[PDB]
Design an enzyme around this catalytic site. Sequence first.
Site, mmCIF file in Angstrom:
data_model
loop_
_atom_site.group_PDB
_atom_site.id
_atom_site.type_symbol
_atom_site.label_atom_id
_atom_site.label_comp_id
_atom_site.label_asym_id
_atom_site.label_seq_id
_atom_site.Cartn_x
_atom_site.Cartn_y
_atom_site.Cartn_z
ATOM 1 C CD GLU A 127 -74.703 -17.077 0.434
ATOM 2 O OE1 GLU A 127 -75.925 -17.164 0.171
ATOM 3 O OE2 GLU A 127 -73.957 -16.276 -0.153
ATOM 4 C CG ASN B 158 -81.878 -16.841 -6.953
ATOM 5 O OD1 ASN B 158 -81.663 -16.276 -5.884
ATOM 6 N ND2 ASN B 158 -81.257 -17.950 -7.312
ATOM 7 C CG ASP C 114 -82.316 -16.429 -12.427
ATOM 8 O OD1 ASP C 114 -82.826 -17.076 -11.493
ATOM 9 O OD2 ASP C 114 -81.099 -16.486 -12.684
ATOM 10 C CG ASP D 168 -79.361 -19.247 -4.432
ATOM 11 O OD1 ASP D 168 -79.246 -19.530 -5.631
ATOM 12 O OD2 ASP D 168 -79.031 -18.136 -3.973
ATOM 13 C CG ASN E 159 -78.224 -20.191 -9.070
ATOM 14 O OD1 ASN E 159 -78.047 -20.344 -10.267
ATOM 15 N ND2 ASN E 159 -79.297 -19.610 -8.578
ATOM 16 C CG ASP F 235 -66.120 -20.338 -11.138
ATOM 17 O OD1 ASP F 235 -65.504 -19.407 -10.565
ATOM 18 O OD2 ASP F 235 -67.361 -20.328 -11.268
#
Length: 129
Positions: A35, A46, A48, A52, A59, A101
């Site tokens: 990463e 990113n 959108d 990050d 994110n 999650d």
Amino acid sequence: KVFGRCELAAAMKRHGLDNYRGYSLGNWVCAAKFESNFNTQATNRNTDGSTDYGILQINSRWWCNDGRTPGSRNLCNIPCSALLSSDITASVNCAKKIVSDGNGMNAWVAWRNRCKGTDVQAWIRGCRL
Ligand SMILES: [Cl-]
Ligand SMILES: [Cl-]
Ligand SMILES: [Cl-]
Ligand code: NA
């Protein structure tokens, strides 16, 4: 800060990540390698508009607030800049929430593509833990 491989493994273990939600320490070190190349200051934007942040590339659309991702939810209740610290505490605490999650470590695309199903214990070989 750019961690060494064994230095990061030891810090991750001290912060409770070894076997957290069933993921052995090598999974976390492998994810951090691909990463961020172990660099706490890594950032990547990113498509959108989210960004990050840090050693685990958390994110801003969901997990932290960077003041420029409209509609983001800040589920770790931190500013994203806190994830760039040389102290990994904030990144680790937020990662514990992400991995819990429901989707496990599949949230980290580089873990999915480059760590999952490999001999991840090689990432902690030789380290004094
Ligand atoms: Cl391991
Ligand atoms: Cl640390
Ligand atoms: Cl990837
Ligand atoms: Na956010």
